[PDB]
Design an enzyme around this catalytic site. Structure first.
Site, PDB file in Angstrom:
ATOM      1  N   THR B  44       1.133  26.790   8.654  1.00 37.59           N
ATOM      2  CA  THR B  44       0.277  27.727   9.374  1.00 37.59           C
ATOM      3  C   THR B  44       1.092  28.838  10.027  1.00 37.59           C
ATOM      4  O   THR B  44       0.597  29.961  10.182  1.00 37.59           O
ATOM      5  CB  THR B  44      -0.549  26.977  10.422  1.00 37.59           C
ATOM      6  OG1 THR B  44      -1.253  25.902   9.790  1.00 37.59           O
ATOM      7  CG2 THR B  44      -1.559  27.904  11.082  1.00 37.59           C
ATOM      8  N   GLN B  90       2.360  16.391   1.030  1.00 44.34           N
ATOM      9  CA  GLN B  90       1.131  16.477   0.254  1.00 44.34           C
ATOM     10  C   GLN B  90       0.663  17.923   0.152  1.00 44.34           C
ATOM     11  O   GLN B  90      -0.505  18.206  -0.113  1.00 44.34           O
ATOM     12  CB  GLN B  90       0.049  15.575   0.849  1.00 44.34           C
ATOM     13  CG  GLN B  90      -0.335  15.875   2.294  1.00 44.34           C
ATOM     14  CD  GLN B  90      -1.433  16.915   2.420  1.00 44.34           C
ATOM     15  OE1 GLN B  90      -2.292  17.038   1.547  1.00 44.34           O
ATOM     16  NE2 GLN B  90      -1.413  17.666   3.512  1.00 44.34           N
ATOM     17  N   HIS B 110       0.558  15.721  -4.098  1.00 46.14           N
ATOM     18  CA  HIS B 110      -0.444  16.633  -4.628  1.00 46.14           C
ATOM     19  C   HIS B 110       0.140  17.681  -5.565  1.00 46.14           C
ATOM     20  O   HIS B 110      -0.619  18.467  -6.141  1.00 46.14           O
ATOM     21  CB  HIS B 110      -1.198  17.320  -3.483  1.00 46.14           C
ATOM     22  CG  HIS B 110      -1.972  16.375  -2.618  1.00 46.14           C
ATOM     23  ND1 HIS B 110      -2.129  15.041  -2.928  1.00 46.14           N
ATOM     24  CD2 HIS B 110      -2.642  16.572  -1.458  1.00 46.14           C
ATOM     25  CE1 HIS B 110      -2.855  14.456  -1.993  1.00 46.14           C
ATOM     26  NE2 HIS B 110      -3.179  15.362  -1.089  1.00 46.14           N
ATOM     27  N   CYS B 118       5.886  18.672 -18.837  1.00 44.17           N
ATOM     28  CA  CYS B 118       5.581  18.538 -20.253  1.00 44.17           C
ATOM     29  C   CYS B 118       4.537  17.447 -20.477  1.00 44.17           C
ATOM     30  O   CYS B 118       4.441  16.474 -19.725  1.00 44.17           O
ATOM     31  CB  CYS B 118       6.846  18.224 -21.049  1.00 44.17           C
ATOM     32  SG  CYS B 118       6.612  18.188 -22.840  1.00 44.17           S
ATOM     33  N   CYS B 121       6.903  14.615 -23.060  1.00 42.99           N
ATOM     34  CA  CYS B 121       8.100  13.961 -22.555  1.00 42.99           C
ATOM     35  C   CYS B 121       8.138  13.849 -21.040  1.00 42.99           C
ATOM     36  O   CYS B 121       9.048  13.200 -20.514  1.00 42.99           O
ATOM     37  CB  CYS B 121       9.359  14.698 -23.039  1.00 42.99           C
ATOM     38  SG  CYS B 121       9.616  16.323 -22.300  1.00 42.99           S
ATOM     39  N   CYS B 154      11.220  19.672 -28.337  1.00 40.44           N
ATOM     40  CA  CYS B 154      10.021  19.006 -27.841  1.00 40.44           C
ATOM     41  C   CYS B 154       8.782  19.827 -28.166  1.00 40.44           C
ATOM     42  O   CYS B 154       7.824  19.309 -28.749  1.00 40.44           O
ATOM     43  CB  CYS B 154      10.122  18.770 -26.334  1.00 40.44           C
ATOM     44  SG  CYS B 154       8.884  17.636 -25.665  1.00 40.44           S
ATOM     45  N   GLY B 191       1.608  17.914  11.273  1.00 40.34           N
ATOM     46  CA  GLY B 191       0.595  18.881  10.880  1.00 40.34           C
ATOM     47  C   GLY B 191      -0.369  18.459   9.792  1.00 40.34           C
ATOM     48  O   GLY B 191      -0.615  19.233   8.858  1.00 40.34           O
ATOM     49  N   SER B 193      -4.164  15.871   9.107  1.00 41.08           N
ATOM     50  CA  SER B 193      -5.270  15.183   9.762  1.00 41.08           C
ATOM     51  C   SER B 193      -5.299  13.695   9.435  1.00 41.08           C
ATOM     52  O   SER B 193      -6.141  12.960   9.961  1.00 41.08           O
ATOM     53  CB  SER B 193      -6.599  15.830   9.368  1.00 41.08           C
ATOM     54  OG  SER B 193      -6.852  15.666   7.984  1.00 41.08           O
ATOM     55  N   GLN B 219      -5.116  18.749  15.830  1.00 37.35           N
ATOM     56  CA  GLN B 219      -6.432  18.154  15.688  1.00 37.35           C
ATOM     57  C   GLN B 219      -6.340  16.636  15.725  1.00 37.35           C
ATOM     58  O   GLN B 219      -5.298  16.056  15.405  1.00 37.35           O
ATOM     59  CB  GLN B 219      -7.070  18.611  14.377  1.00 37.35           C
ATOM     60  CG  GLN B 219      -7.295  20.119  14.270  1.00 37.35           C
ATOM     61  CD  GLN B 219      -8.437  20.632  15.137  1.00 37.35           C
ATOM     62  OE1 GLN B 219      -8.656  20.164  16.254  1.00 37.35           O
ATOM     63  NE2 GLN B 219      -9.168  21.608  14.617  1.00 37.35           N
TER      64      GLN B 219
END
Lengths: 118, 270, 85, 95, 109, 96, 111, 84, 99
Positions: B44, B90, B110, B118, B121, B154, B191, B193, B219
């Site tokens: 933030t 995350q 996340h 890839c 592979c 590949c 930081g 929740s 929060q």
DNA sequence: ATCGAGAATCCCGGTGCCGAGGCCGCTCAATTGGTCGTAGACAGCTCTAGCACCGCTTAAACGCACGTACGCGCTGTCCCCCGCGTTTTAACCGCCAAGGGGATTACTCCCTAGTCTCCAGGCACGTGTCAGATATATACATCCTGTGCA
DNA sequence: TGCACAGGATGTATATATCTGACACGTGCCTGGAGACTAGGGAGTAATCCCCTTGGCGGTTAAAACGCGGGGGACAGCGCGTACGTGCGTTTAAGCGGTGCTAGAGCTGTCTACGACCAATTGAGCGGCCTCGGCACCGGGATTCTCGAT
């Protein structure tokens, strides 16, 4: 007479060169064949075999298996675009099909859209 | 960006910031294996807007020129000086990697906007420009890992690492973070929740095997209970008095950089 | 060998057709499909067997071998790996 | 009593060269053996047609190269041509 | 999470809604390899078709096995094309007209 | 001058006059018929050669050609071609 | 000295050259030996196919009020017959056009 | 000394509509012209690759019609009326 | 009064009938020849083309496009329409094998 | 559901004209006659799978009840394509060079086919073993329900 | 009416333990590929020869491009009826294991007749050359759909 080294060893290959030469001369392809044609054809065959069989091995390792079965061969052939183009219409026994479900058939819509819950 | 903002804020009274930052620096010392957790509130300070945030309402042009915050420069130095076992983030901003923090100590549950993977592979590429695709879909580039014996490459369809709701989670990362929390001595979330799971349940499992828990968030969290210390002040200024009672200061953010492994033990006092 | 014919097309039951469609990737199947695919399958089979027999009787044999079937399939523009070679 | 030749030992050698710890079953062995002598006859037939098309009676390296560049698509064709050229040059240099 | 990790935070066995067992069967039969038709009925069908060309023939086991594999592969491919044709017409049920169109475009009718 | 070129023009013309005494044929249609004859010839010859090779045999006899034409031509065409070929072979063997 | 030297095509009672067919069979790399009845059989079947196609093409030409065959007539003959259309399935004939065919749904309604 | 760039647009909209009318199409959408040009380009390059390969195998510099005939026969598309 | 004007759909039918009984090539010669030369420049520079070569290429391409358009029309009619759209061409090429 | 303008198509008869069809000379490929050596026809055995039948277990096919999701028919709209003028734009047609390259001979030499010996790479076979299938036995993250408070 | 927990219930993960039949490997033959050697003809250069490809110019219109007004059809909603998926109890015949019999699939010899090959012989077939008519265009009327009144 001499040491009598095989032609495959001299060419640094694994596939037989003499067998390919005999098949070329006994297959009614032409009146005579050259000296380098068997080497070139054996090298091409070995390269294709190595490509297919490395992809099959990778697919087999991906499924916690240490053996290559026809299912892995089919998976390796199908997931590769160029090999699938080469084997465009070839049926492999005990191979199955790729897992594929059309997007329309999925139910969906069962998820919150995050719109402040109305 | 409309309606209202139904958010209660207490900012906790200033005198008890020093008290429980001193008390937090206490627990920092005798902890041998600290696993940090990070959330959106860390960024933030850098002005990084877009889930609650989506419900209340694509800044890729802001992403490409984003600047890591003060605390981002803190954690990388804490890694470079020791007393930091693992980091779990995350966030999808990718500031941790660009901050020089080693990737082997980082668990991006996340994903990251700046990383491709890839599809054949499962190797990972860290680009410098923003990957313009969301939802584990095609990118347009191709894998370039070269096999041996003169065979082909590949050439797999590169995809992004930004997830979507109800999709699966990275195995390599989830397992790593779990082992980390099981082998945790202290955890300090910053930081977030503590609401979105399965990530949110990582901190609590810290105390499950006889551990502590420190939460820092403006929060309230659904896991304020079962804690050890609850911080309610701004993460930008609380870390200042964190580091002031320990020592050292931020070296620099000398532009975007990537670090794969960690430096051999610890420079500077431990 | 004494018995000649009966209604053997019904040996390809409805659940087998639904299993084949499921492997194909079909979600819902109509009621008139079952009488269609059977009629398709026969036209396929007699287009291959008729060739294989043509091979079998060329070698003065009285037994349809796997190689005859493989050759007949290859002649149809449809090869089959796993039985010949 | 009679010997039936096949490309089993050769493809197993290639397998152990590219994957030193992965085996292969008998059905996959037969499938690979069929693939090898399918591609063999495909390339040989293309080369025979290519030689008849130019009023020649010799299948030299050029006909095989052109056949494999006509049959194989793209990267497969280029890599196969490179491998064949390498093998031919090594065979001629070693005398 | 040792189960359904995923992303989020949160009468008589419901009979299942009409179309979940369908996808379950689709996945089950798409990750399998075995044949899908009973073997003796297929062998009897093959013998019936064969004895209209030359009377009193004999079959190797490999012959009927190869015929069964080829037939199943052909039918699976035809059904995939039929599904594409049915989806093209804004439907999910496959009609016989879809099979007819798929066979007409391929050049088989 | 230039070398000779083999073509089936005169024989196709003889057959056309055999079946239609008055109609003629242009040059492009004659070329199309020549191409058709060559294509059918190569199809039948290739199928017969493969049939001979499958049985470890070194000769293409009339049996191989008959099996090839029953493999390639469909139904009525196959039966009529077989009848015509057998008639021609019987006439050739008896007359000589 | 010798006989009157009839040709083998005349001996077999057919118009196509069996000698030329035998030459193209020997010198075309099909087998290692060639029988003495294979050229006769192949010439007979080639003549049969040619006669069938030419008869259909001539019938089409008469239907078109012309006395000389053109590729359009050959295309019509091979596309209006269900046997040759499947023997020559995927083959394009130059300057042949297509069969006149319009789907019934595209025709105007209310009439 | 000669470079040709924008030739795929030589196949104009009226030509595509004429070809579709011979196919039996009654009413034509406005977006199929680009699709038709793309598929025509793909087919042409697929055929011409084999044709040029056939010419260069013979050490020639002129693409003969017979090379095109062989290249078309290769892809299972026989062409009568051009010899061979 | 109003000038004579045909209703939309009958001139198209007349076009279909006229072009289905004629045999000449439909695309112009020089643009197709230039396209062939431009495509061929990407495989070997400084090439030459016989007239019969480009004639054969055009003759094959026209038949290919006519057959593809017949399949496209069948696909469009299957979907209760009379117009052909790119999705019909895509479906026809999926089924045929080009994909 | 019926008339009438009007654009479009199909006979009608001239008219050049270039291509289909017949003639002739001559290299060259088909024919005739004889020799020969091997490919394949014809018997005869061996034994290997192919066929027929019986019991038993149980997995799967079958028949029926029921509810809901999906296919099909109307209905409206508005937007995209078709038809007709008018103006550019460039294709098409004749004609002419100027070579660049495909064909054609001559000649030679080096590359490949026969053949001949021999010995080791590759195949048939027996064997111990190990990968893949099944079957419990602990461990853990969620999820559901019962008993007290503003 | 809504929290606050505690503890039982649910589904998933990792770890051993047994079994079994296919596989990796070692051994003994054996015949096919390799090493020498020679003969001949296939093809690689070299040099002409002409033909057909490409580039240029120019006049003439055929056709493409652009514009504009309607109209009809593509698409999105509704609404209803039925047919297809799902679950449960019967039954039925497939799958397996076993025994038995024999039809013919492979393989080995023996012999003969039939294509390959080589010289002489000669006539069907090809290239070149004329020659006349089937046919593609020229209008002129005579029908023939087509669409708007009524």
């Amino acid at each position: 007479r001499a040491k009598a080294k095989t032609r495959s060893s001299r060419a640094g290959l694994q596939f037989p060169v003499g067998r390919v030469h005999r098949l070329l001369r006994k297959g009614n392809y032409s009146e005579r064949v050259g000296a380098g044609a068997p080497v070139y054809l054996a090298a091409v065959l070995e390269y294709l075999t190595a490509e297919i069989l490395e992809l099959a091995g990778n697919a087999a390792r991906d499924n916690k298996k240490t053996r290559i079965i026809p299912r892995h061969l089919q998976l390796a052939i199908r997931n590769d675009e160029e090999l699938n183009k080469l084997l465009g219409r070839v049926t492999i026994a005990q191979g199955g099909v790729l897992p594929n479900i059309q997007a329309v058939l999925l139910p969906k819509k069962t998820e919150s859209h995050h719109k402040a819950k109305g | 960006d409309k309606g209202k903002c139904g958010l209660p804020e207490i900012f906790d009274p200033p005198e008890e910031l020093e008290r429980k930052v001193w008390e937090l620096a206490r627990l920092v010392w005798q902890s041998s294996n600290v696993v940090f957790h990070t959330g959106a509130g860390i960024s933030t300070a850098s002005g990084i807007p877009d889930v609650w945030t989506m419900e209340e309402r694509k800044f890729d042009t802001t992403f490409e020129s984003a600047r890591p915050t003060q605390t981002h420069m803190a954690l990388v130095q804490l890694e470079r000086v020791g007393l930091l076992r693992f980091l779990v983030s995350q966030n999808v901003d990718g500031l941790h990697v660009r901050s020089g923090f080693p990737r082997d100590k980082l668990a991006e549950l996340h994903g990251n906007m700046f990383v491709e993977e890839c599809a054949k592979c499962k190797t990972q590429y860290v680009r410098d420009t923003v990957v313009g695709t969301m939802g584990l879909k095609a990118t347009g580039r191709l894998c370039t890992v070269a096999k041996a014996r003169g065979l082909r490459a590949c050439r797999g369809e590169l995809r992004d690492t930004i997830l979507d709701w109800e999709d699966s989670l990275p195995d390599r990362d989830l397992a790593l973070a779990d082992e980390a929390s099981r082998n945790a001595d202290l955890s300090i979330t910053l930081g977030t929740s503590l609401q979105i799971r399965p990530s949110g349940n990582l901190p609590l499992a810290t105390k499950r095997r006889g551990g502590r828990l420190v939460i820092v968030n403006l929060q309230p969290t659904k896991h304020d209970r079962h804690a050890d210390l609850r911080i309610h002040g701004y993460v930008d200024e609380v870390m200042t008095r964190l580091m002031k009672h320990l020592g050292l200061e931020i070296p620099a953010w000398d532009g975007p950089r990537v670090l794969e492994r960690a430096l051999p033990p610890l420079p500077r006092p431990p | 060998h004494r018995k000649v014919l009966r209604d053997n097309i019904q040996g390809i039951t409805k659940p087998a057709i639904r299993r084949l469609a499921r492997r194909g990737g079909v979600k819902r199947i109509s009621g008139l499909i079952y009488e269609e695919t059977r009629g398709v399958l026969k036209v396929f089979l007699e287009n291959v067997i008729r060739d294989a027999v043509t091979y079998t009787e060329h070698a003065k044999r009285k037994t349809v071998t796997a190689m005859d079937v493989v050759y007949a399939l290859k002649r149809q523009g449809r090869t089959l790996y796993g039985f010949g070679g | 009593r009679s010997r039936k030749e096949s490309y089993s030992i050769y493809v197993y050698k290639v397998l152990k060269q590219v994957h030193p710890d992965t085996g292969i079953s008998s059905k996959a062995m037969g499938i690979m053996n069929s693939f090898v002598n399918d591609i063999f006859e495909r390339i040989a037939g293309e080369a025979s047609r290519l030689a008849h098309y130019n009023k020649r009676s010799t299948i030299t390296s050029r006909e095989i190269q052109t056949a494999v560049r006509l049959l194989l698509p793209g990267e497969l064709a280029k890599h196969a041509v490179s491998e064949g050229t390498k093998a031919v040059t090594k065979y001629t240099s070693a005398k | 999470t040792k189960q359904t990790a995923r992303k989020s935070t949160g009468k008589k066995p419901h009979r299942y809604r009409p179309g979940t067992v369908a996808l379950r069967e689709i996945r089950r039969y798409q990750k399998s390899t075995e044949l899908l038709i009973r073997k003796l009925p297929f062998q009897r069908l093959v013998r019936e078709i064969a004895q209209d060309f030359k009377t009193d023939l004999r079959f190797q086991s490999s012959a009927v096995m190869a015929l069964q594999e080829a037939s199943e592969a052909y039918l699976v491919a035809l059904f995939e094309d039929t599904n594409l044709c049915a989806i093209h017409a804004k439907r999910v049920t496959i009609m016989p007209k879809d099979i007819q169109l798929a066979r007409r475009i391929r050049g088989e009718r």
